[PDB]
Amino acid sequence: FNVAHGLAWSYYIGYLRLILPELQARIRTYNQHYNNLLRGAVSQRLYILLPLDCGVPDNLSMADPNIRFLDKLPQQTGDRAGIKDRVYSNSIYELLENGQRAGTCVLEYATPLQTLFAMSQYSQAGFSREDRLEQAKLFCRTLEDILADAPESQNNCRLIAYQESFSLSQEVLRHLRQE
Amino acid sequence: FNVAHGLAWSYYIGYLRLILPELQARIRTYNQHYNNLLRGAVSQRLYILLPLDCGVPDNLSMADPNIRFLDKLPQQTGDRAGIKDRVYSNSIYELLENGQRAGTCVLEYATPLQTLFAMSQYSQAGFSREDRLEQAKLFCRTLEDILADAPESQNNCRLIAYQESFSLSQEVLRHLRQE
Numbered sequence A, B: 001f002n003v004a005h006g007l008a009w010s011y012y013i014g015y016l017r018l019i020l021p022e023l024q025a026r027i028r029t030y031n032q033h034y035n036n037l038l039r040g041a042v043s044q045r046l047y048i049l050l051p052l053d054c055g056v057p058d059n060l061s062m063a064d065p066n067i068r069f070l071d072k073l074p075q076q077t078g079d080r081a082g083i084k085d086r087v088y089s090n091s092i093y094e095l096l097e098n099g100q101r102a103g104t105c106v107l108e109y110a111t112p113l114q115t116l117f118a119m120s121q122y123s124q125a126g127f128s129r130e131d132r133l134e135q136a137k138l139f140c141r142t143l144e145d146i147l148a149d150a151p152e153s154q155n156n157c158r159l160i161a162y163q164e165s166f167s168l169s170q171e172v173l174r175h176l177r178q179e
């Protein structure tokens, strides 16, 4: 173990609560400079990928070649715990359908899941691969419950959970099109 | 709960393992440009403050006015979990003795402790203030044990634990002078 409870709460307090209040204005700033009638605007919410037992690569294109990096948002800075101008950066991605762009949005993995699965490599961590699917689901359970009691944050992000045919770019496009 | 075990392991895997291998070269880069015989060079290790039951402000000067921000190190970047060029920044601080600079080093709090104590504010987190001193000590216990089995990381950082007369700038200067 039940290590997920701590990681889910850290993820919310130490990150989501910090960027989500300012995300909509950064997306607005980007769209105002780059949006025109020949293209779709960047979506308005943060899309968080939650692979429950898959890999968590750093390059999204290597999980699905139809997801490709497009641009960065404007940086967000803030002093935290003695670090001056700590940087919070996010990336914009395009979603391809039949070789053509069909969507764009701010996209990223839930990093603590990556940290959680990497405890694989250390015996003193007491985390075996047999527990990842269970702790990963609990992480999603805890985080789902937290944003239920925090509407202002729930409406600025969307969770996308999945396991291992199925296309990750299509799953993303499904959520974008229900908005 | 025993939430510290997860937070300590996340802190090591998701941060210390990432910056400590490259810290010595960034400090070298800074000293080479700004060091001269009229001043002391920036120390070579990362000094991590671990307040076990005190406050964790973002501005170190407000914990002790003899600790003042000096400069930033060169940024470190790296793609992580879909975020392109994720930024890892650190700050340099000067330590004052009788109104004169007596030391300089890279200094910061162990951020997860700040995240841990902020779970104060949420009932669904199940963390009461009566447990902070216990979980904080466990966090230090777990992290101390991890760097015992990781020498290469132990020699690039120094842990500084303390509770609530006593000067935080003097405690820091003590460690710098034993090096």
Ligand SMILES: Nc1ncnc2c1ncn2[C@@H]1O[C@@H]2COP(=O)(O)O[C@H]3[C@H](O)[C@H](n4cnc5c(N)ncnc54)O[C@@H]3COP(=O)(O)O[C@H]2[C@@H]1O
Pocket (backbone or CB within 6 Å): A010, A011, A013, A014, A015, A083, A087, A088, A089, A111, A112, A115, B010, B011, B013, B014, B015, B083, B087, B088, B089, B111, B112, B115
């Ligand atoms: N700028 C950012 N961009 C995207 N996501 C962010 C983020 N800052 C925090 N998060 C996410 O929130 C989790 C918990 O953050 P904490 O600050 O409480 O606890 C963090 C703590 O801040 C430290 N850490 C991580 N990145 C750091 C950085 N760039 N500078 C200083 N400390 C860092 O390591 C702990 C565990 O890291 P994780 O396993 O990655 O788990 C992180 C995860 O990276």
